[PDB]
Design a protein around this ligand. Structure first.
Ligand SMILES: [Zn+2]
Ligand SMILES: [Zn+2]
Ligand SMILES: [Zn+2]
Ligand SMILES: [Zn+2]
Lengths: 136, 136
RNA sequence: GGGUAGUGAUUUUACCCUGGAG
RNA sequence: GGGUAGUGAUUUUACCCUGGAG
């Protein structure tokens, strides 16, 4: 078992340095409490243009053991959609509701309809009017 | 001499409390060193909708002696244009270049052409690429 | 993403609305 | 107001462009 599936949120990310850590709250479908940190490098972020993650954004990902710890292979939003990125990202506040794509909107989305995800942090467990992250 | 003309910048303003102070750097056209604080109440701000000032924005105003100190009567931006207001003000970042009105833009502005004022703080002494306030 | 306001004398504001739709 | 990017292992980023025009 070399390639594992993980889900969580971004713990922290430094845009300039190009890396940070994910907080894995579920490993291969099983809930982790406490969560386990997974290293993330910008090169592995599923996004349009310049890559970064914002603290607290919901992620789904594949990872592996590395000499330095746990390393993520590909990092997406829940259900394989794109990541949100840094609050300072250009066009970062005009994403399609379905995929997170900066190019269009949900009425023009040709991808299959996705489960509703938080307008602020992409969580599939809550909605923006109840977003613990936005409440900061 | 009851009504005086003054000019300066906003020292501070608390939007919830509805008051703050102006740093008067010129009284009746004559430069002051040190500047003198002038009280300002939201009721006296020349602006469209909910009133507030942001720290550092350039003002012109009329003022008078009050029991508590100096009180401003009317507060405008340089040359009688509208104030900028709190950074959090709805539509606050989409003002006409000539008057600062929220309703339109410089092409459709019918007021006489005004001296060029900073895009960030409305100063008539500098431009945005050299703004000491934005440089914070 | 969007909205509303009002403690008058020295320091940076409080609410609200938003889920098959912008 | 707008743009560009790239230090791989534990903490929130660096530049730039913009003045009779958006
Ligand atoms: Zn889409
Ligand atoms: Zn959320
Ligand atoms: Zn105008
Ligand atoms: Zn300025």
């Amino acid at each position: 078992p070399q390639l594992l599936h993980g889900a969580g949120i971004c713990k922290w990310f430094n845009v300039r340095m190009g890396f940070g850590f994910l907080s894995m709250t579920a490993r291969a479908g099983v809930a982790l409490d406490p969560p386990v940190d997974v290293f993330v490098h910008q090169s592995k972020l599923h996004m349009e243009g310049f890559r970064s993650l914002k603290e607290g954004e919901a992620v789904e990902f594949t990872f592996k053991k590395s000499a330095k710890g746990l390393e993520s292979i590909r990092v997406t939003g829940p259900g394989g959609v794109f990541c949100i990125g840094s609050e300072r990202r250009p066009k970062g506040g005009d994403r399609c509701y379905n995929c997170g794509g900066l190019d269009h909107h949900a009425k023009e989305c040709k991808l299959p309809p996705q489960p509703k995800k938080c307008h602020f942090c992409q969580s599939i467990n809550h909605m923006v009017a109840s977003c613990p992250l936005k409440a900061q």
